[PDB]
Amino acid sequence: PCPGACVCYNEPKVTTSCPQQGLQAVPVGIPAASQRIFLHGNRISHVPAASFRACRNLTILWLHSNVLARIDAAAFTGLALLEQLDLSDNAQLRSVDPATFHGLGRLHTLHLDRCGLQELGPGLFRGLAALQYLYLQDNALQALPDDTFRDLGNLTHLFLHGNRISSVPERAFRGLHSLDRLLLHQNRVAHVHPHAFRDLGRLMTLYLFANNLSALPTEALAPLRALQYLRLNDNPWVCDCRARPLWAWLQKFRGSSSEVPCSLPQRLAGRDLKRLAANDLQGC
């Protein structure tokens, strides 16, 4: 039968729906045939190991807007066919054991936005070869470890805006060959490594606005062969010698770019680097 507080139906997909009830625990007895489980908007604070193990055909699991504080490392064991997992809006989660998503080889969408996440642990996204959308915005991330996304060969959207990231290291984005949109705005980025985007050959959208960049190496932009939309506004660009390479790259860029306002020298304050003549910049 259907557990209390839940409503169950069989078509078009077997669904067990128990959202917005104020539940503290995962209902016991969720139909093993469930393809979709909706538990969002409750007051669940812990997801025990094998909480959904019997539901081998589960493809959609919503646990967003709960009060998750801890997810057992084996919470999603048995869910090899899982395609969409929404854990967003659990602001006190703070950390996810790095083995939590291992084995989710069919996962296409993973929502971890607004989870107070402080770090991306070793192997957190290992083996998620089918992942296409990864939402990590509005968390508490401050660093991007090397190769964190290297197995995400099919990822097309990576949202990291609204965190406190201060640097983009050389190997942060290795392996993201299918990436189409990379959102890094509203962070504290002060430095981008010259080879930070080496593998992003299909990237079409790059947002870096609202950060702390005073300069950006053109070598980082050089391999972005498909780039079409670039936002660099709202950074304290210094328009002296150091802006000459970026100025030349902006002249060559055939896509769409935002204004690139100079913060210094006063003479050029407020002026868009794109609209200046190289004659306007101090020489090196």
Ligand X SMILES: *[C@H]1O[C@H](CO)[C@@H](O[C@H]2O[C@H](CO)[C@@H](O[C@H]3O[C@H](CO[C@H]4O[C@H](CO)[C@@H](O)[C@H](O)[C@@H]4O)[C@@H](O)[C@H](O)[C@@H]3O)[C@H](O)[C@H]2NC(C)=O)[C@H](O)[C@H]1NC(C)=O
Ligand Y SMILES: *[C@@H]1O[C@H](CO)[C@@H](O[C@H]2O[C@H](CO)[C@@H](O[C@@H]3O[C@H](CO)[C@@H](O)[C@H](O)[C@@H]3O)[C@H](O)[C@H]2NC(C)=O)[C@H](O)[C@H]1NC(C)=O
Residues near ligand Y (CB under 6 A) are 129-130, 154
Q: Which of 56/191 has CB closer to ligand X?
A: 56
- Please tell me whether residue 2 binds ligand X under the rule CB under 6 A: no
Half-sphere exposure of 65 (CA within 13 A, CB side): 11
Q: Which helix (H) or strand (E) holds 209?
A: none
To ligand Y, the closest distance from the beta carbon of 129 in angstroms equals 4
**8 A C-beta contact, residue 128 and residue 151:** yes
Interaction partner, residue 276 (ligand X, ligand Y, none; CB < 5-8 Å by kind)? none
Instruction: For the chain, count helices (H), then strands (E).
Output: 2, 18
Q: How far apart are the C-alpha atoms of 19 and 6, rounded to whole Å?
A: 8
Comparing every residue's Cβ against ligand Y, the nearest one is 130
Q: How far apart are the C-alpha atoms of 232 and 90, rounded to whole Å?
A: 31
- Please tell me whether residue 210 binds ligand X under the rule CB under 6 A: no
Task: Locate 115 and state its tokens.
Answer: 């989870």
Q: Which of 60, 64, 125, 67 is nearest to 99 (CA)?
A: 125
Interface with ligand X in residues 18-57 (CB under 6 A): 32-33, 56-57
Q: Which of 58/206 has CB closer to ligand X?
A: 58
- The pairs formed by 279-283 with CB atoms below 8 angstroms and a separation of 24 or more are 280/239, 281/239, 281/240, 281/241, 281/243, 281/244, 281/247, 282/240, 282/241, 283/241, 283/244
Interaction partner, residue 167 (ligand X, ligand Y, none; CB < 5-8 Å by kind)? none
Interaction partner, residue 80 (ligand Y, ligand X, none; CB < 5-8 Å by kind)? none
To ligand Y, the closest distance from the beta carbon of 154 in angstroms equals 4
To ligand X, the closest distance from the beta carbon of 77 in angstroms equals 16
Q: Which of 33/226 has CB closer to ligand X?
A: 33
Residues that bind ligand X (rule: CB under 6 A) add up to a total of 4
Interaction partner, residue 25 (ligand Y, ligand X, none; CB < 5-8 Å by kind)? none
To ligand Y, the closest distance from the beta carbon of 251 in angstroms equals 36
CA-to-CA dists, residue 219 to 25, 245, 284, angstroms: 51, 9, 18
Q: Which of 99/129 has CB closer to ligand Y?
A: 129
| Residue bearing tokens 């947002």 | 207
Interface with ligand X in residues 54-73 (CB under 6 A): 56-57
Interaction partner, residue 129 (ligand Y, ligand X, none; CB < 5-8 Å by kind)? ligand Y
Q: Which of 32/129 has CB closer to ligand Y?
A: 129
φ and ψ of 64, to 5 deg: -75, 160
> Is-cis flag, bond preceding 217, omega within 30?
no
Q: How far apart are the C-alpha atoms of 182 and 197, rounded to whole Å?
A: 10
Q: Which of 154/228 has CB closer to ligand Y?
A: 154
DSSP label of 272: B
Q: Which of 150/274 has CB closer to ligand Y?
A: 150
Interaction partner, residue 130 (ligand X, ligand Y, none; CB < 5-8 Å by kind)? ligand Y
To ligand X, the closest distance from the beta carbon of 132 in angstroms equals 23
Residues that bind ligand X (CB under 6 A): 32-33, 56-57
